[PDB]
Structure 1
Amino acid sequence: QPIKLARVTKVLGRTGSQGQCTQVRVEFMDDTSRSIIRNVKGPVREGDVLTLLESEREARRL
């Protein structure tokens, strides 16, 4: 469970029967830099920084 600092590249939008979860895409900084995606709750600004405390959480899309 490593704390990894990643940069937001693109924010998808909201999901739910009424809308309750927010999709973003994050690129790592020092882990053989690549891009993954993850869902997230609450305000996450334009191009802010995410903390991937775990390197395996993937969010299902649609």
Structure 2
Amino acid sequence: PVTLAKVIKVLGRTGSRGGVTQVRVEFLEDASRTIVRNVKGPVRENDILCLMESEREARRLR
């Protein structure tokens, strides 16, 4: 039940310490439903990082 989502744009650094990044993902199969999600490690564009759950957006962290 995992969905794979290629990242297409690195939005910017979020989180209190700046250790997590907002990113815009695109699914490898069914190339639509582009989502903004947060990722912990360093990220370039064209990363195939996989998502355990897909139906959740992300917003700014306090």
* TM bracket, shorter-chain basis: 0.7 to 0.9
Query: Normalised by the size of structure 1, how large is the TM-score?
Result: 0.75
**Alignment length, in residue pairs?**
61
Q: Distance in 2 between matches of 1:5 and 1:16?
A: 24
| Uncovered stretches (5+) of structure 1, i.e. residues with no partner | none
What is the root-mean-square deviation of aligned Cα atoms in Å?
A: 2.0
Q: Distance in 2 between matches of 1:20 and 1:45?
A: 15
Identity of aligned residues (%): 74
2:10–2:44 Cα contact (<8 Å) kept: no
Q: Which runs of 4+ in 1 moved over 4 A?
A: none
Query: Normalised by the size of structure 2, how large is the TM-score?
Result: 0.75
Seen in structure 2, the aligned counterparts of structure 1 residues 61 and 31 have a Cα distance that, compared at 3 Å, is: farther
| Uncovered stretches (5+) of structure 2, i.e. residues with no partner | none
